[PDB]
Ligand binder design. Structure first.
Ligand SMILES: [Zn+2]
Lengths: 68, 191, 94, 189, 52, 172
RNA sequence: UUCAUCUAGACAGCCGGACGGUGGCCAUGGAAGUCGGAAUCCGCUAAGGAGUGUGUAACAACUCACCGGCCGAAUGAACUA
């Protein structure tokens, strides 16, 4: 029963996505999303990169398929 | 509310063998193929295990979680419309004028034409297309009976007959005659 | 009783006209009530009366079309008294 | 959970009080018979056609209020009648076979099956004689009243019976379709 | 004549429907609103005046 | 006015020595700074008992900082506002991280789904819902589940140069 | 915003019972489950109205509240802007 379905790959945000701060004052550091607060705001924790523990938005940040 | 995520679980029987890409669906099974242009629903698909198909929406509205049910009701017809198939029946009702129909091949077209509706002299003509096949049914009481694989093919022309054989310029609820659908069946049920 | 809303049956089998009285609701009352019946309340509505008649409640199965089979005398208490307000004859059970 | 407080005292107060259970049931019943065969059992035998209780089969069948009761778990199939019988095993199997069919239909019950007509005169007054334009029975009429000539069929299977098909049969004193009683299961204490 | 088990089958498409009291559109036999926008999905639904 | 601060505030109703030592009332309000924290304090108590600015005073004013500004939790909230026609009393359930971040949305929220502006709303009591399953509005309850985590389609990317040679895709 | 429900199976949908007294008292031309007034009751219980919807000569007919079996999780009734 070969029933070919396309691939439709994504980048879905489980606790353990390392992200990339595109604008702000981290400006290219590596956080880790920890407590998803709402659909647009997202918590971060990357404390040895020099970041705070804040709840940034989603338009302010990009991410990567690398995931712990 | 703009719901975050829903799904449905479309079944694929063993006789049919689906083959989809990005938004174009090509079903094929025991009795030929159907293909469905589906480029306006904005939903994604993921195989789970060889018979169950996942459909998905993420961050819909109200209407974009309603149409996510509409894409379900199209595909499950297609696995039914290839394996189980359809067959309609379509009964005469006529008083004081027999409603005699006959089929014509007028230059590649295959019209089905209807004569003596409500005592007119005028000759009807109704075209069909591929994917249907009528049959003037006998051993039973005076029906036209057609079949096919889609549901856009069987119902559309056959209800257009029921759109043709409505009386006009008289009243309606007293001149009851015409052609009307009786039962929407499958060509092979009950196995 | 007559051609009002009650029932009397008739059966014909081989020269036998069943003029029997299954005798639906009214004749249980009318055979108890006082003989001036036909006058003075056959113009307006018939629910006028403050009369109490009898305590002979054991006539409650042998008169009219029983289908209950449940109480020795507690049938027509639980049928009527309510269904005609032309006499009381049972003073509490509404 | 439409009516659970008026009928769950009545689920309690005499479901403990009876020692042997004889289940019956009719999914789709009559009403001349449901002022008969529910009303004729008066005094000790409420025929219980109540509802499904399928969360409280775990408080009724686990605490063991009655020792030989825990059997009715898969038996809520069809509208269940479980008459309470603390009566011996002599008057049981002959009263539960009372009738199969009853008085004819309510002019349009579901009956898609075949029927037979015998050549016996009934005594129909001249009524519906100008209303036989569905089959057209060749009928002799002896000075006002009809008479069946020969034995012909009516119709095949796969149709629906409404007014003009049942009412000739409702005026015919034949009704083998009344969808009556069943016989299911008996068990002691 | 048309026998009364196929006057029924042509009843279900011509007569036994409902209408809107405002725009006289033809409506299904069980509904709440005229779907047709010019009377604004209103609520006034009567049956259709049958024969006789 | 702005992204708000949050305050306590305590007033006294100036002691006439005929009947001295009054009772030292207290609010806990929301404000953009301290001068409007003062000038909304009389407004809550002018509608309560006969005090005005020439009867009492502020005896101290403190910017309350929130205890755990990073932990997530559910805020229950009771809201009274004035509509175009008739006043109402509501119950939203905002989902945020700290108290002035909670009602930062709600002034901006009920200005959208009701068009109730800032001067016509009385944010009365802002509780918290600390445990699950009794958040009454279930649209924020469905967030509070086990490994729910979701994709996010249609990633536009930014634009700095006005032209582009690439015709981008939106894989994400 | 309330008021009701709410895995003791809800709201659907599929199957149908929807009576006995009685085809209530009259009121008439007779009003019978479905024209008017008034009595507005009990039996059976699963549950049935002294009847919510059509039909007629009072008829006879449909089927609904009330119910009983199935999937199995939730849904209505007014409002407010
Ligand atoms: Zn309309």
């Amino acid at each position: 029963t070969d029933s070919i379905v396309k691939a439709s790959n994504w980048r879905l945000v489980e606790v353990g996505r390392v992200v990339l701060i595109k604008k702000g004052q981290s400006a290219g550091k590596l956080a880790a999303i920890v407590e998803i607060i709402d659909q647009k705001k997202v918590l971060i924790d990357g404390p040895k990169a020099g970041v705070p523990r804040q709840a940034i938005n989603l338009g302010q940040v990009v991410l990567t398929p690398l995931t712990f | 509310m703009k719901y975050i995520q829903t799904e449905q679980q479309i079944e694929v029987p063993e006789g049919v063998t689906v083959s989809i890409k990005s938004r174009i669906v090509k079903v094929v099974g025991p009795r030929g193929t159907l293909t469905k242009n589906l480029k306006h629903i904005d939903v994604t698909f993921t195989k789970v295990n060889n018979q169950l198909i996942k459909v998905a929406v993420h961050n819909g509205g109200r209407k974009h979680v309603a149409a996510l049910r509409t894409v379900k009701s199209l595909v499950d017809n297609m696995i039914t419309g290839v394996t189980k198939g359809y067959k309609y029946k379509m009964r005469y009702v006529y008083a004081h004028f027999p409603i005699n129909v006959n089929i014509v091949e007028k230059d590649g077209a295959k019209f089905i034409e209807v004569r003596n509706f409500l005592g007119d002299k005028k000759i009807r003509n109704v075209p069909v297309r591929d994917g249907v096949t009528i049959e003037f049914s006998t051993n039973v009481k005076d029906e036209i009976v057609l079949s096919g694989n889609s549901v856009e093919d069987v119902s559309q022309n056959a209800a257009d007959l029921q759109q043709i054989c409505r009386v006009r310029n008289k009243d309606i609820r007293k001149f009851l005659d015409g052609i009307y659908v009786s039962h929407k069946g499958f060509i092979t049920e009950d196995l | 009783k007559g051609i009002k809303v009650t029932v009397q049956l008739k059966i014909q089998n081989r020269q036998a006209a069943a003029s029997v009285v299954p005798s639906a609701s009214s004749l249980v009352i009318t055979a108890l009530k006082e003989p001036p019946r036909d006058r003075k309340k056959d113009k307006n509505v018939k629910h006028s009366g403050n009369i109490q008649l009898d305590e002979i409640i054991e006539i409650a199965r042998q008169m009219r079309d029983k289908s209950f089979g449940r109480t020795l005398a507690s049938v027509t208490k639980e049928i009527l008294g309510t269904a005609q307000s032309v006499g009381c004859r049972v003073d509490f059970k509404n | 959970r439409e009516k659970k407080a008026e009928y769950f005292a009545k689920l309690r107060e005499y479901l403990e009080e009876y020692k042997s259970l004889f289940v019956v049931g009719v999914d789709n019943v009559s009403s001349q018979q449901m002022h008969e065969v529910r009303k004729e059992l008066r005094g000790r035998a409420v025929v219980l056609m109540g509802k499904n209780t399928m969360v409280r089969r775990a408080i009724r069948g686990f605490l063991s209020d009655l020792p030989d009761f825990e059997k009715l778990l898969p038996f809520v199939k069809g509208n269940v009648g479980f008459v309470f019988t603390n009566e011996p095993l002599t008057e049981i199997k002959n009263v539960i076979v009372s009738n199969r069919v009853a008085a004819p239909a309510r002019a349009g019950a579901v009956a898609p099956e075949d029927i037979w007509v015998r050549a016996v005169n009934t005594g129909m007054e001249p009524g519906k004689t100008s209303f036989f334009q569905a089959l057209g029975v060749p009928t002799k009429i002896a000075r006002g009243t009809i008479e069946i000539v020969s034995d012909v069929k009516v119709v095949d299977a796969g149709n629906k019976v409404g007014q003009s098909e049942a009412s000739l049969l409702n005026l015919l004193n034949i009704s083998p379709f009344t969808f009556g009683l069943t016989v299911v299961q008996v068990y002691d204490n | 004549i048309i026998e009364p088990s196929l006057k029924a089958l042509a009843s279900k498409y011509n007569c036994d429907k409902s209408v809107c009291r405002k725009c006289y559109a033809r409506l299904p036999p069980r509904a709440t609103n005229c779907r047709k926008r010019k009377c604004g999905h209103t609520n006034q639904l009567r049956p259709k005046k049958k024969l006789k | 006015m702005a992204h708000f601060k949050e305050y306590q505030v305590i007033g006294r109703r100036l002691p006439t020595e005929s009947v001295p030592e009054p009772k030292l009332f207290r609010m806990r309000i929301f404000a953009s700074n301290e001068v409007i924290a003062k000038s909304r304090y009389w407004y809550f108590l002018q509608k309560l008992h006969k005090v005005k600015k020439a009867s009492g005073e502020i005896v101290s004013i403190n910017q309350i900082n929130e205890a755990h500004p990073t932990k997530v939790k559910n805020f229950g909230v009771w809201v009274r506002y004035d509509s175009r026609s008739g006043t109402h009393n509501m119950y939203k359930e905002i989902r945020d991280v700290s108290r002035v971040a909670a009602v930062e949305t709600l002034y901006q929220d009920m200005a959208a789904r009701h068009r109730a502006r800032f001067r016509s709303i009385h944010i009365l009591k802002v509780a918290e819902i600390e445990k699950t399953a009794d958040v009454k509005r279930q649209y924020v309850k469905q967030f509070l589940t086990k490994d729910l985590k979701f994709p996010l389609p249609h990633r536009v990317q930014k634009s700095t140069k006005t032209f582009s040679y690439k015709r981008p895709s939106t894989f994400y």
